[model samples]
Target: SVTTDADKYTPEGQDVSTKTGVVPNPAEGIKNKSDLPDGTKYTWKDTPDISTEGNKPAVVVVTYPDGSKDEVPVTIHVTN
Candidate 1:
């Protein structure tokens, strides 16, 4: 799950956090694993403050227990 502040403003510093979980397909069993333990906390890095009026891209990297990782994309909008 992804967490963010309302309106995700670029000029304002935004905090982004994510939690990993498993989803079971019943007969299919567990479809995927986040590899992260429960309650694992993550923060965004290398994100620059918004200076222009537009949608900016931000990314969060998540690493699973298996060493596999995934990139989560987030958008921040700025206004004059």
Candidate 2:
């Protein structure tokens, strides 16, 4: 069975060449994620430098249904 869950995380590192300029949307495929916080909207702050590979932080805007937002500071290791 081919599942879509495995392609979300990049623990070791991420290569931009294989990404095809597609930034992952965490909100996608979350219909069954009852444990995940109810973030009505996810607005990503900065786009990674896929052109010039390097380490950069990709903070996600987590907007709850209560009209609150939190920017989760996460790092994206670009290895291409």
Best by lDDT: 2
Give per-residue CA lDDT, model 2, range 1-80, as digits (tens): 54222223222222122243456564432333354344356556676544545555566655555555555555545554
lDDT of each: 0.36, 0.46
- What local lDDT does model 1 show for residue 26? 18
**Which residue pairs of candidate 2 clash?**
none
lDDT of 1 by residue, 1-80 (tens): 54332112112223232222321111111112233344323334344345555555565444333444444555444445
Task: Estimate the TM-score for candidate 1.
Answer: 0.36
Each prediction's TM-score versus the true structure: 0.36, 0.50
Mind sharing the TM-score for model 2?
0.50
